[PDB]
């Protein structure tokens, strides 16, 4: 088992590494069709790289690279998309938002750290399972928490795994930087969940629409951090249609597998989206999702964050294109 995965570790140790500037990841509608889990892990190395977090927080080198590969292996392989690639697109949106969006001139590097680590810990060790499934399939982790149990577990595994061996990038942090780190990451991973995002978002939009937002008023700023977090948690939809076909028809088939669990180990009378029968009607029920979190958030992420506009546009392009599949 591990012998093959560590053979992949030599694939890290013995393969060509295309540059991130060659690999279009700075582009928001990026082609992740060709990247392997290894190459996406390398882009994740870029994500830790350019955010100026390593210099500002003294991260260890290979401890970070194998932070990335260890998170790459910890995901159960039965999962269709909510694995390492999901973290790849999420922190792709995070890295791109904090570099291509040039937000660093605004918000502090501490916050860039909280954004990145919470972005890669938006969905740690995701089992193809959301909050609801464990809340009703009753995995012990569910009883371990209450609200946003997967994400309370993602903060739990943030503070745990980063303190766990092979992952101590928190080691270089000063106690203040460390405090702001795990705390803002706490609230943000709570907001990495689309739900507690829906909870926190209204204060944000009220503080954004009037162009009255201020970064010398820090709680608003951290709330913006959480907004970018949720903006990143669903970023896979930003990807191009030939590829997006794969991505959101794996949203289809993977919520049809989790949905198979919804109609085997759960046996609910099916809800319209995750029913497989809506194979040519599921995308509309993605659009109503996109309207509910995506566009609603990327509008504010448009009027404050700037070059991050395509992160909105790169989603909207999918709309009708999925409506086509949603049009039988």
């Amino acid at each position: 088992s591990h012998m093959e995965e560590t053979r992949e570790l030599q694939s890290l140790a013995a393969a060509v590494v295309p540059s991130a500037q060659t690999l279009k990841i700075t582009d928001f509608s990026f082609s992740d069709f060709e990247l392997s889990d290894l190459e996406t892990a390398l882009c994740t190395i870029r994500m830790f790289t350019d955010l100026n977090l390593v210099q500002n927080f003294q991260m260890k080198h290979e401890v970070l690279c194998r932070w990335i590969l260890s998170v790459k292996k910890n995901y159960r392989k039965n999962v269709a998309y909510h694995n390492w690639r999901h973290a790849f697109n999420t922190a792709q949106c995070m890295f791109a938002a904090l570099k291509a969006g040039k937000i660093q001139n605004k918000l502090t590097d501490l916050e860039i750290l909280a954004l990145l680590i919470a972005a890669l810990s938006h969905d740690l060790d995701h089992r193809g399972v959301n909050n609801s499934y464990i809340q009703r399939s009753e995995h012990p982790l569910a009883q371990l928490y209450c609200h946003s149990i997967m994400e309370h577990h993602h903060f739990d595994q943030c503070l745990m795994i980063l303190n766990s061996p092979g992952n101590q990038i928190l080691s270089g942090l000063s106690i203040e930087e460390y405090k702001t780190t795990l705390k803002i990451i706490k609230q943000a991973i709570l907001a990495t969940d689309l739900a507690l995002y829906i909870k926190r978002r209204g204060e944000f939009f009220e503080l954004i629409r009037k162009n009255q937002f201020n970064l010398e008023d820090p709680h608003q700023k951290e709330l913006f951090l959480a907004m970018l977090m949720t903006a990143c948690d669903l970023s896979a939809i930003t990807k191009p249609w030939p590829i997006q076909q794969r991505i959101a028809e794996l949203v289809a088939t993977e919520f049809w597998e989790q949905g198979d669990l919804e109609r085997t180990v759960l046996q609910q009378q099916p809800i319209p989206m995750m029913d497989r029968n809506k194979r040519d009607e599921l995308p509309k029920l993605q659009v109503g999702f996109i309207d509910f979190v995506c566009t609603q958030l990327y509008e504010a992420l448009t009027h404050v964050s700037e070059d991050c506009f395509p992160l909105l546009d790169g989603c909207r392009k999918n709309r009708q294109k999925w409506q086509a599949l949603a049009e039988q």
Binding site: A14, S19, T22, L23, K24, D27
Partner: protein, 161 residues
């Protein structure tokens, strides 16, 4: 007399392969043609090492780890290695592809000599000199291709800005 031709055949493979840098596939066409013409081998296959494993199109791929195999042993070594008795295969000239160095970039193996049923010691070093031109053509035309694909995909990433 006869003793003055085979080097100018290297002039031929030079004037050819150094003018075919634009594409690797055509380079393979000219190489397979010139090699099946000059080596007198009925067939051949050209491995290309990658850390610990050889790679070959002979366009279905063929693979063999550097530790395993006899040709793989050549990948481990880079020794030129004749096999006068192969076991219509009857002999194999197993010598490294090489290039800039004796380091094993790959492992060629010729099969079935014309003129003298066995491969000779003559059927060794000449293949190496042929592999000078072929090895430079490979390393540098692939050097050209990597620059092409990579630096091109870079401006493909340039698209938004």
């Amino acid at each position: 007399q006869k003793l003055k031709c085979e080097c100018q055949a290297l002039l031929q493979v030079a004037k050819n392969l150094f003018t075919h840098l634009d594409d690797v596939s055509v380079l393979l066409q000219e190489i397979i043609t010139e090699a099946r013409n000059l080596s007198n081998a009925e067939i051949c296959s050209v491995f290309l090492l990658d850390q610990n494993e050889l790679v070959a199109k002979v366009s279905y791929e063929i693979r063999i780890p550097a530790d395993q195999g006899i040709a793989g042993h050549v990948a481990t070594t880079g020794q030129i290695l004749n096999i006068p008795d192969a076991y219509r295969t009857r002999n194999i000239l197993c010598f490294p592809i090489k290039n800039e160095n004796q380091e094993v970039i790959g492992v060629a193996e010729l099969v079935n000599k014309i003129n003298g049923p066995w491969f000779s010691k003559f059927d060794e070093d000449l293949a190496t000199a042929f592999s000078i031109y072929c090895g430079i053509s490979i390393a540098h035309s692939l050097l050209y291709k990597k620059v092409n694909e990579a630096q091109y995909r870079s401006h493909l990433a340039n698209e938004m800005m």
